[PDB]
From a paper:
The CA domain and immediate downstream residues mediate protein interactions in the immature shell, and, following proteolytic cleavage, CA forms the mature viral capsid.
Immature [name] particles were purified from the culture medium of HEK293T cells transfected with a proviral [name] plasmid containing a mutation in the viral PR gene. Subtomogram averaging was performed essentially : subtomograms were extracted at positions underneath the spherical viral membrane and were subjected to iterative alignment and averaging, resulting in a structure of the hexameric immature CA lattice at 6.6-Å resolution. The structure shows two distinct curved layers corresponding to CA-NTD and CA-CTD. The CA-NTD forms a hexamer in the immature lattice, at the center of which is a parallel helical bundle formed by helix 1, surrounding a central pore (black hexagon). Hexamers are packed together by a dimeric interface in which the C-terminal end of helix 7 (black arrowhead) interacts with the loop between helices 4 and 5 (red arrowhead). After fitting the CA-NTD and the truncated CA-CTD into the electron density map, there was clear density projecting toward the center of the particle that was not occupied by the domain structures. As this six-helix structure is positioned between the truncated CA-CTD and NC domains of [name], it must consist of residues of the CAH that had been deleted in the CA-CTDΔCAH protein used for X-ray crystallography. In the CA-CTD, an additional density is seen for helix 310b in the subtomogram averaged structure (black arrowhead), indicating that the helix is present in the immature virus and is not an artifact of crystallization. Here, we show that, in immature [name], the CAH at the C-terminal end of CA forms a similar helical bundle.
Author numbering:
A (entry chain A), B (entry chain A), C (entry chain A), D (entry chain B): 16 to 236
The structure:
């Protein structure tokens, strides 16, 4: 029904604004509505701009795997899995159904990867600890940026040193300089670094603490 | 009607954003619409992402109880209560109806527990008293975090020392240091601690009080 | 129509968030739609959570009155007025209609009282005059909290000393200390107290007034 | 057989003395003997005193859940699940059998909760470290009291600060005073606290150590 298509469009941000929204909606519809190849063209054509759809389609074709489970750029294999022109898939046949299943899976992959927005290498670098922001709150914002703007899971054990380095570099300057000077820095987990940053953050100075220090200095000399 | 399903989706945050919203909507629908097992698959499939649904389904299976009222991980019992594949339940039979009742109850449990978001042990620690925030207002925010992000009821008598310790640790530093030094601290109720914190909060200094203190010091010397 | 029920739900906050919203909607519907007992179960079941509905139902049963106009906890009387299980009320009979009228009235009472949220004894105490807030503006916020979070009408003559005491206690500290010291304090109306607080609020000091005082002090010595 | 009933009674402590004993025996019998409602009355009537049985029965009725999986105090629902008077349950019917299953489950719940003995808030506070008792041995006794006399599992992550506070408060006075003074106390796990207490416990003084200190003081002056 065109009312469904337009409602989906109108109740969500554009793909470019926030890819997660439409991707999740389309992932759901791909299941509940079991769209054919033509139906998928209407979905994409209605919910995405020309430039977004193109990104998604190339990303979907890049997600095709050969029978050895590895990527393939062989035209015939790519075309057979994710055709750009109407295929002869017959939904009354197991053959047709299997192609439809795969097509939908690849379409989803395409959207997920096109959303990735080319490892937002700048959005992650732009997460800097605020002057009042606790180290744990800053770390959560930094992890959120990794999730949204990179393909790397900040909770993976293999990403720990990577997240740790961003955490040290992008902490407030006093904190970052002290974390950098920690003894056996290589041995510090992300949790260790947060605890060390908290010691600096919590055992610092405050306007009341500055008034107390000024009073103690005036009592001294 | 697909219009109902999509309306429910579009008028609520995602499950991940705020699990309470969709959980309450689904709890209601489970009653008013008396869904079958297939209907429940459409509900879940339409309102949740693939990753959310999975969490919910495993949480629902973890909520199954044996005839002795205790948890069970026995495949046959788990499968019989909360099947992952279409069951042969016939709604025209008391047997079918009872399974449907239980299934819906477990589905709800699954959502409630999946929402729990693994005892947000960080969200509770992140509630810190603001510099202008009264102790009672801070305590209410702290209790709200316990409710939303842990399975513990902050109003339970058995949670009092737990909430008390968070209250002391996460109060503004001047207040927390004084609460920690209270005589017979073990004997203080949560209400006592709030009253003691209020004494510090209210009998402190203000910019007008600082101007008065500076005037009194200038009158002194 | 399920569209009406779901529209009512989706266009309002939850009962817990703001009880007034749904209570007013349901009060209206109880009149325009003249619901039967089953209809009321759908209303409640759809618009309230399990925990909210329970609160409302117990509150409704607590609102039942005997023939002497007084509360009654006599099971038969409570059950007859507000049955928890489907009653045999026949809307084609004056008997059935009268029970329906009473049921709807009690349902409304239940919601009104369940909303009361147990005399939010903390929300009223949490209304504190802001540093720039006029005494009359503060008093209006304090009265709003009485209305929303207690069963007491702050405009009732019998509540005047009660509101007066909250007004004095929760005024800005300089104001509250002076109001407390007023001669013949017992004789002061709420209006008197507001006028006395205004004298303190308006005849105080300002940054321009502080600059003028500093200039006068520098001219003095 | 009355011999079984009296043997069970005579080979166990009373419910009041140690609820776990009879509860475990009855849980077993409820399974192996598949008792009817009347059989359960004989079990309870024979193994419990009048006052114990009453506690158990009210606790069992308090454990009844509605179809939404939540507690219910609706007379008809409570009565239907756990009747105080002989029900018409026919064990030759699936309907009768299901009620029997539920009844037995609720009976067990009732006993488990009646045993709880109202969160023995005093038994837990009464666990104090002995003068020769190691911190780990004391902690195990403290956890045992939580298990026996509260509904809280001392091994739950959400109970850690609660157990930690009891551990600090009820440690031997020298130990408790030092644990209270630990830097970053909020950051200490239960395991950390035990290790810190062990440092105090093991690096203290002994009668031989006192003789050595007296000899060193006599050598000094």
């Amino acid at each position: 029904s065109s009312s469904d298509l337009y409602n989906w469009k109108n109740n969500n941000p554009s793909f470019s604004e926030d890819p997660g929204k439409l991707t999740a909606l389309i992932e759901s519809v791909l299941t509940t509505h079991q769209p054919t190849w033509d139906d998928c063209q209407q979905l994409l054509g209605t919910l995405l701009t020309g430039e977004e759809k193109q990104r998604v389609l190339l990303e979907a074709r890049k997600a095709v795997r050969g029978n050895d489970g590895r990527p393939t750029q062989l035209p015939n294999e790519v075309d057979a899995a994710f055709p750009l022109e109407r295929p002869d898939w017959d939904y009354t046949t197991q053959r047709g159904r299997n192609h439809l299943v795969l097509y939908r899976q690849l379409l989803l992959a395409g959207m997920q990867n096109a959303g990735r927005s080319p490892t937002n290498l700048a959005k992650v670098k732009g997460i800097t600890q605020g002057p009042n922001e606790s180290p744990s709150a800053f770390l959560e914002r930094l992890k959120e940026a990794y999730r949204r703007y990179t393909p790397y899971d900040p909770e993976d054990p293999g990403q720990e040193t990577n997240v740790s380095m961003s955490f040290i570099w992008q902490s407030a300057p006093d904190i970052g300089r002290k974390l950098e000077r920690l003894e056996d820095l290589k041995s510090k987990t992300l949790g260790d670094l947060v605890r060390e940053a908290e010691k600096i953050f919590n055992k610092r100075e405050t306007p009341e603490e500055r008034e107390e220090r000024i009073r103690r200095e005036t009592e001294e000399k």
